[PDB]
Design a protein around this ligand. Sequence first.
Ligand SMILES: Cc1c(-c2ccccc2)ccc2nc(N)nc(N)c12
Length: 446
Amino acid sequence: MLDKIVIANRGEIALRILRACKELGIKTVAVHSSADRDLKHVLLADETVCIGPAPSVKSYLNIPAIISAAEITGAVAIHPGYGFLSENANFAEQVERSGFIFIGPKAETIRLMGDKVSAIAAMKKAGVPCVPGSDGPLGDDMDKNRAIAKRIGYPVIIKASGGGGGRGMRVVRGDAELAQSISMTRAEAKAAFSNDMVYMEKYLENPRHVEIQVLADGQGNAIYLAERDCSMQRRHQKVVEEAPAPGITPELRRYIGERCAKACVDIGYRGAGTFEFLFENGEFYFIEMNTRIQVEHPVTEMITGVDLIKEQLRIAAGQPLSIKQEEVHVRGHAVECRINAEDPNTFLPSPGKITRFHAPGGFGVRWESHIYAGYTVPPYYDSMIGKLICYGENRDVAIARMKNALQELIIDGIKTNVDLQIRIMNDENFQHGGTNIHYLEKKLGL
Ligand SMILES: Cc1c(-c2ccccc2)ccc2nc(N)nc(N)c12
């Protein structure tokens, strides 16, 4: 096993990784900004290194500082968590070039999945169903681009190859708006990604967001760990995630899961990963792959018994996956509610000092958060301060436990979305299940 690792992240995910390390007897190095000295995981870590000031550019995105911290502490690996540098192929490359293990796939694989055009080509080649599209980047010939749009059939959507997670796309409903839509998407892509490449897909009207979790080791094993429905979202920010996805049968799960695992083998995938799909009229369409462990990983852990972070670390050390595909069983149901420090009317981050804190407990209740009484949520980082995960023998029990747990949760001194989460749990359409990606924003609009 890895002797010692740098946790190149903060907040709840840093604590999550620290726990997994502690379980495996791995020494921890907590790199942190000057604003994060009193983070729970920092206080629990074996060694700590202040890598810079509050702003992320000089701390959590500071590649030299992070690598230097690994060097000086004699760490052997770096876990990037999610966000920050976790999908930064150049960082992964530098980590490996510097002689440390990057907890993720090969840098070339990160780069492939970061190039949405090339990722789709690879997935399509491997037998994964994709959205009907341009199958290549759009040029500047608008006669050709109109022909592609006609072949696909309107509405279509223009997307930046360097984008993803809702970033760098726009819907086109007729020829009249096509040229300008392509030009603007391209200009925004150039400005944001220093990559002006764009592509076209059919715009699905009312899909659900359903993603598949995979794990692949360096011994050739690749497994899928069911799916997650992430359709309950606002402006591409997930709000509630659940596993399994309501209405997905064992046969569909098998069908799409096997295709994702096969794709992993074809591309030489290593580590945890997520295949994102749109799901509509009983059909899956691949849009994007993530290579990091994600925020919503805990729902998959609850329904499979697999500790995904521990698997990442075992894989990185050269150990095979601790479980075979035949040993992966979906059992029960899990729901995750993201807890955000945000204003209820604006939805802007609402930082501040927590004056009173109480976490929920009980059977099937899992609380993932670094916060504590007297902890100050800084203004410099994301608004998500914790994750409440509830498991039950079925979806109704999971939801009932969530309702109870949300009622026990006390976070005074700052504004949170606990009340909104309670409203969602009480929503009759959510209780029925299978609401589409548009549902929450429509509910909030009314
Ligand atoms: C709906 C949608 C999303 C999308 C995913 C998660 C949250 C919000 C939107 C992402 C990519 C998408 N791509 C196509 N071609 N069509 C969609 N309808 C779509």
